[PDB]
Structure formats: C-alpha cells, structure tokens
Design a protein around this ligand. Structure first.
Ligand SMILES: Nc1ncnc2c1ncn2[C@@H]1O[C@H](CSCC[C@H](N)C(=O)O)[C@@H](O)[C@H]1O
Ligand SMILES: CCCCCCCCCC[N+](C)(C)CCCCCCCCCC
Length: 283
C-alpha cells in the first residue's frame, strides 16, 4: 500500500502562507469545539484538542502517535500540556518541514518525531493514538488496514481517538426529508475533483464496522456537527478579508475555489447532510 502522496499533497502543499490566511495561528485544520459561547477560533481549536487528548488517559512518558499530524498543533499541545513523547505522520512536504522546525526549536525534553510518511509505512509500537481529519483521505478501501495496524501498534490498554467527518448516502438522504440532494452530490463532486483529490467520506456504521471487525470497542461517539459550520464560517470570513493577499500568493482562481469550498461545506453542516464525530476506540 503506497500512500497517496500526490493527491494529499495536491491540497496541503499548496502554500503554508496561503492556509495561514484563513486558519487560526495554531494552523489547526479541522472542526473546532466552542465549549463556551464567546470562544475565539484559537481557543475553540485548543478546546477541541483537549477534548480529543482528554479521552486518551495520557500519562508522562507515554508515546503518542498523531496520524495526519497536520501542522503539528496537536503534537506540541500533547508535549507541552500533557508531557508525553510524540510521533507525527503526514504526507505533506510543507507540513513535515514546518513541524520539523517546531521540533528542532522546542525546549521541551520529550521525544518528538515527525515523518513524511503514511501510516501505511509506519509499524512501530505506541501507547496511544489520535487522528483528526486524516481518515477522510484514507479511502474506504484502506479503512480495514488502518484499524488493523492501529490495533496492532497499541498496548493492551491502548486507546485511539479517531475524529472524522461522516456522511450520509445520497440515495438514503432523500428519505431524511432533505431536499437539494442533486446539489449535494454535485458539490461532493466539486470537492473531490478540485479540493480533495481522492477524498472519501465514511458513514458512521462503516467506522463502527471496521473498528469492531478489528478488535476495537467504540465506547463513545461524540458529534461536533454544529461546531463545524461556525468553524467554517470563521475560516471563510478571514480568507475573504485576506482576498488581496490570497491572489498575490496564488491566483484569484485559487481564491474563488477555496471560498466556494469553505462556504459550501459550512451550509452542508448547517443543514445536516454531513456530520463530524470523535470515536473513542478502546482495545
Ligand atoms: N495515509 C495517510 N497517512 C498519514 N497522514 C495522512 C494520510 N492521509 C492524509 N494524511 C494527513 O492528514 C492530515 C489531514 C488534518 C491536520 C491535523 N490533524 C489537524 O489540524 C494532513 O496532515 C495529511 O497529510
Ligand atoms: C464525498 C467526498 C468527501 C471527500 C472529503 C475530503 C475531506 C478532507 C477533510 C480535510 N480537513 C480535515 C483538513 C478539513 C477541511 C474542512 C472540512 C471539509 C468538509 C468536506 C465535506 C465534503 C462532503
């Protein structure tokens, strides 16, 4: 199984400078958690991180594996607030380099590693696992392999917090009393073709199946559905105000595409065609 470096890199290696125009300072690129009403995006992203890490029963000395570490905000938070060693995986060249600098400049004593590789090329024992918004890039065809590896790399009391967007079947969506449909399907095509090449959304039962079939017990499924529309609204508001900057670094063609993507997804979550859930997978 050769990781899909090309497709994944197609999106995230666009330009850190560009993503910085709409993501919060920690560069977290996933659904935030507005635990409190007046939280800033940065505070809500940290709260999301704590929500995920707080389910792992972390302890000093442990080694945490972050599958699809992104720009590393989660890894560094794990080190700094929870005092654990970390290992981060990503197919993005720019992310690997960025996190490599965070590691190089850290004054914390814990072990920190970032690899430009996929879980498909990682076979090392870890104490706990966290994966936020990376699953959507694996593809239905590799779900079983992922959980197999996850279960194999974890200790006896191991735990994996899998956070991923989930979707309903377009055919069955019509019964949910949800109009549009065609519009939804047409937008999904747009996303997979111009935003996330190779992307694929898993249904909740699909995650529950691959987990159980590989020896895991899903002890909790928490939805952050409403929180994503706001996260996306905040991302789009910033990008738009940074429009002039967006075109300079790239092109107005890229800008238009990203605004269409950010805003569109926001409505999709608002109406309920898509969801986002954190699965506590207990070994
Ligand atoms: N097969 C695979 N193995 C490892 N990382 C993968 C992957 N497919 C996608 N990813 C990574 O998952 C991330 C999406 C999201 C970023 C972070 N978890 C927050 O913020 C990217 O960093 C991407 O490179
Ligand atoms: C139906 C095809 C779905 C492909 C989904 C690809 C998802 C990539 C998610 C990447 N992160 C975690 C960085 C988040 C980006 C913002 C939310 C995007 C939601 C897309 C929903 C498409 C239905």
């Amino acid at each position: 199984l050769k990781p899909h470096f090309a497709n994944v890199q197609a999106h995230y290696d666009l330009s850190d400078d560009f993503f910085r125009l709409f993501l919060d300072p920690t560069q977290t690129y996933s659904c935030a958690y507005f635990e409190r009403d007046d939280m800033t995006l940065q505070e809500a992203q940290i709260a999301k991180i704590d929500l995920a890490l707080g389910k792992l029963g972390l302890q000093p000395g442990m080694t945490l594996l972050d599958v699809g570490c992104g720009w590393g905000a989660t890894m560094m938070r794990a080190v700094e607030k929870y005092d654990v060693n970390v290992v981060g995986l990503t197919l993005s060249k720019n992310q690997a380099n960025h996190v490599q600098q965070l590691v190089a400049n850290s004054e914390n004593l814990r072990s920190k590693r970032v690899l430009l590789a996929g879980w498909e090329q990682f076979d090392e024992p870890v104490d706990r696992i966290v994966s936020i918004g990376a699953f959507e890039h694996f593809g239905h065809e590799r779900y079983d392999a992922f959980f197999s590896l996850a279960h194999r790399l974890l200790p006896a009391d191991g735990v994996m917090l899998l956070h991923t967007i989930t979707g309903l079947h377009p055919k069955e969506i019509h019964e949910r009393g949800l109009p549009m449909s065609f519009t939804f399907a047409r937008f999904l095509k747009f996303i997979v073709t111009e935003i996330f090449p190779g992307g694929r959304l898993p249904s909740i039962p699909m995650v529950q199946e691959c987990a159980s079939a590989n020896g895991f017990t899903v002890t909790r499924v928490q939805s952050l559905q409403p929180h994503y529309a706001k996260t996306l609204d905040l991302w789009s508001a910033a990008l738009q105000a940074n429009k002039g900057q967006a075109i300079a670094l790239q092109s107005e063609e890229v800008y238009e595409r990203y605004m269409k993507y950010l805003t569109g997804c926001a409505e999709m979550f608002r109406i309920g065609y898509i969801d986002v859930n954190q699965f506590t997978c207990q070994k």
